[PDB]
Scaffold this active site. Sequence first.
Site, PDB file in Angstrom:
ATOM      1  N   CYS A   1     -10.583  11.500 -27.886  1.00 22.01           N
ATOM      2  CA  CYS A   1     -11.206  10.778 -26.548  1.00 22.01           C
ATOM      3  C   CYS A   1     -11.774   9.369 -27.054  1.00 22.01           C
ATOM      4  CB  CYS A   1     -12.314  11.590 -25.948  1.00 22.01           C
ATOM      5  SG  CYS A   1     -11.338  12.917 -25.087  1.00 22.01           S
TER       6      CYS A   1
ATOM      7  N   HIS B   1     -18.883  11.425 -21.411  1.00 16.88           N
ATOM      8  CA  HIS B   1     -18.960  12.918 -21.846  1.00 16.88           C
ATOM      9  C   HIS B   1     -19.558  12.890 -23.166  1.00 16.88           C
ATOM     10  CE1 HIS B   1     -15.304  13.564 -23.873  1.00 16.88           C
ATOM     11  NE2 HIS B   1     -14.555  13.283 -23.084  1.00 16.88           N
TER      12      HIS B   1
ATOM     13  N   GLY C   1     -10.956  15.368 -30.839  1.00 15.06           N
ATOM     14  CA  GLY C   1     -11.705  14.092 -31.270  1.00 15.06           C
ATOM     15  C   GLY C   1     -10.867  12.844 -30.756  1.00 15.06           C
TER      16      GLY C   1
HETATM   17  C1  H63 Z   1     -11.602  14.154 -25.946  1.00 17.66           C
HETATM   18  O1  H63 Z   1     -11.522  13.946 -27.207  1.00 17.66           O
HETATM   19  C2  H63 Z   1     -11.018  15.377 -25.497  1.00 17.66           C
HETATM   20  C3  H63 Z   1      -9.409  15.322 -25.569  1.00 17.66           C
HETATM   21  C4  H63 Z   1      -8.511  16.598 -25.571  1.00 17.66           C
HETATM   22  C5  H63 Z   1      -8.787  17.292 -26.806  1.00 17.66           C
HETATM   23  C6  H63 Z   1      -7.571  18.196 -26.681  1.00 17.66           C
HETATM   24  N1  H63 Z   1      -6.432  16.941 -26.464  1.00 17.66           N
HETATM   25  C7  H63 Z   1      -6.831  16.083 -25.320  1.00 17.66           C
HETATM   26  O2  H63 Z   1      -6.428  15.214 -24.937  1.00 17.66           O
HETATM   27  N2  H63 Z   1     -11.350  15.623 -24.199  1.00 17.66           N
HETATM   28  C8  H63 Z   1     -11.822  16.962 -23.571  1.00 17.66           C
HETATM   29  O3  H63 Z   1     -11.709  17.925 -24.274  1.00 17.66           O
HETATM   30  C9  H63 Z   1     -12.185  17.076 -22.279  1.00 17.66           C
HETATM   31  C10 H63 Z   1     -13.842  16.862 -22.063  1.00 17.66           C
HETATM   32  C11 H63 Z   1     -14.456  17.310 -20.841  1.00 17.66           C
HETATM   33  C12 H63 Z   1     -15.604  16.313 -20.442  1.00 17.66           C
HETATM   34  C13 H63 Z   1     -16.868  17.372 -20.386  1.00 17.66           C
HETATM   35  N3  H63 Z   1     -12.044  18.504 -21.676  1.00 17.66           N
HETATM   36  C14 H63 Z   1     -10.765  18.725 -21.573  1.00 17.66           C
HETATM   37  O4  H63 Z   1      -9.650  17.685 -21.597  1.00 17.66           O
HETATM   38  C15 H63 Z   1     -10.211  20.121 -20.900  1.00 17.66           C
HETATM   39  C16 H63 Z   1      -9.291  20.175 -19.970  1.00 17.66           C
HETATM   40  C17 H63 Z   1      -8.899  21.535 -19.782  1.00 17.66           C
HETATM   41  C18 H63 Z   1      -7.668  22.018 -19.431  1.00 17.66           C
HETATM   42  C19 H63 Z   1      -7.327  23.537 -19.170  1.00 17.66           C
HETATM   43  C20 H63 Z   1      -8.274  24.471 -18.783  1.00 17.66           C
HETATM   44  C21 H63 Z   1      -9.715  23.933 -19.166  1.00 17.66           C
HETATM   45  C22 H63 Z   1      -9.960  22.547 -19.526  1.00 17.66           C
END
Ligand code: H63
Lengths: 304, 301
Positions: free
Chosen positions: A143, A39, A141
């Site tokens: 991931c 992603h 950040g």
């Molecule tokens: C990567 O860095 C990130 C890790 C998150 C940031 C905050 N804590 C973590 O572990 N990953 C994401 O943000 C991920 C990317 C999606 C791919 C396009 N999105 C989510 O993890 C969002 C989940 C969510 C939860 C509740 C409502 C909507 C979305």
Amino acid sequence: FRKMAFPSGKVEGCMVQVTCGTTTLNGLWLDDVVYCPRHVICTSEDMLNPNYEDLLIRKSNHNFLVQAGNVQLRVIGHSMQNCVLKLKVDTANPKTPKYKFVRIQPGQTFSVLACYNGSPSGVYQCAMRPNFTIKGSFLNGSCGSVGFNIDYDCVSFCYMHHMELPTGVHAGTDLEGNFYGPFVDRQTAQAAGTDTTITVNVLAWLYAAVINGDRWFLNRFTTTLNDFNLVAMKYNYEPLTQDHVDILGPLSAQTGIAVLDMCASLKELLQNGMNGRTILGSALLEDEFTPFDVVRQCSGVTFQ
Amino acid sequence: SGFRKMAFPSGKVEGCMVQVTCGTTTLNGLWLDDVVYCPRHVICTSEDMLNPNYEDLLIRKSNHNFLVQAGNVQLRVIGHSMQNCVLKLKVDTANPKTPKYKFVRIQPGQTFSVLACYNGSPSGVYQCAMRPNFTIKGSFLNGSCGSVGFNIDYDCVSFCYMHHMELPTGVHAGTDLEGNFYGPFVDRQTAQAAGTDTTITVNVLAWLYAAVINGDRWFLNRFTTTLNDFNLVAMKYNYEPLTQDHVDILGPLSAQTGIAVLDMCASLKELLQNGMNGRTILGSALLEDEFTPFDVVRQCS
Ligand SMILES: *C(=O)[C@H](C[C@@H]1CCNC1=O)NC(=O)[C@H](CCCC)NC(=O)/C=C/c1ccccc1
Ligand SMILES: *C(=O)[C@H](C[C@@H]1CCNC1=O)NC(=O)[C@H](CCCC)NC(=O)/C=C/c1ccccc1
């Protein structure tokens, strides 16, 4: 007995930064390949249901900025394997440790090296929950941070971080890009299955208590495995597999307490309470310490 | 988001760990540039350990009595001196992996990461705190002496601890890197007790703020308290006093959560007076005091 991470230096030497557009996350640099969440190629207006196959057709090698620190590693090839991107780079990592990619089972523990912009910031120990989430600590950040075990001098990589769930727990893939559990790399709210207690680890914790002379809970009963499993599920405990019985073998031999006798002892703790007492100082039964984790911490000889 | 006991990445320290052997005794040393630091009691036989005259044992040693191993290669000892309870072995090789570093002496209540090593092999890393009675609640087995504790800031490693002793109660005692013990302990083979321990109040409050940042508010109340009346109750319950400096250091957590420091003190007072009543905070049945305010901010921001 204490929750301990593996020393992270072998993994720190593998952490890099991967940028596509304005999105930066972490990658894992092993020989001349960099592994990272796919992603990274998403735009803020396309995360809801990205078509990764068609998003990647739009990308060339020169769209990927891979950096070790501030030093650029030129990308000479790219492909997607499940939910991970594999970027071939012009430089074989001289810090590449001996390594394997492995897919872990629920209950297994591992160390996480939380990283930001390719820079390691912390290390902690996690357990894969039976619902295939982990109770991690991740900021924006994070991931591409990885989880791992170390056996002798070989690093077994088992987790790469992708997602946070509404409940605050975390989800990700193995290093072939296959998610643990039913999650997908989409910007959606995804519910974890209802969790359970990791029975094999509770039993490991009881063995650890016995090893330390804390053994009041040892009763005079035994049980069959099937009988135990059926009761355990009624207290939201995971059932035991043949493999669980076998990884408890060393602790059973060390203490002289048959696996099924300890199961009967745990069954009593589930049907009654702790009365008032504690085990290893705690009123709660710990379930994030594996049998391996207990065996290792018994002496300096075994822990080295 | 989330909360874990988090250690600093240990790679910069791993490249410094070596094995030091004298006679029958083996432990770990710290190799920085061309000096190896290790506990002086490596020169003791089991006879000597009961009542060592350390100046006495050392003048009878020569350089070749010390075998220093770094991974697989022997380093040659070409000089030795003693500074308080640590030995400084000069070797004929500079450690190419020497990080930028400082020796610091930490205060009670501060935290550090421990790299537990055995025969020069790093084997685990975990987070500890210097207790008010100058012990540490570590996990150290046989052969762990010379393992170090440290903090990292940017690229600079602040070594604050080297491991020497286990007490009968299972807690641990050690020195700074100038060889001076934390607390009233000595490097002799005797059973030693510490002073009465107390709970690190400012850290409990940081941890309660962490629990609020991670979405758990059951323990809050609408009471408030003055600082002095809070300290009266804290002292009654074997908690360290909370100073105005502590109150200021909690400022950023207070601003982030919108809970005034003295309001959180009122929560903690109620928890001390009523108990937790079988409930949990961040999965813990007990109040946790080994996270500093800086630790919480670092992990939750
Ligand atoms: C990567 O860095 C990130 C890790 C998150 C940031 C905050 N804590 C973590 O572990 N990953 C994401 O943000 C991920 C990317 C999606 C791919 C396009 N999105 C989510 O993890 C969002 C989940 C969510 C939860 C509740 C409502 C909507 C979305
Ligand atoms: C160094 O490796 C070792 C660390 C101990 C071993 C077990 N867990 C640890 O942390 N240090 C010692 O063994 C130390 C040697 C100092 C004498 C020269 N001795 C002790 O720690 C003795 C503890 C003790 C406890 C009860 C009664 C007598 C002695």
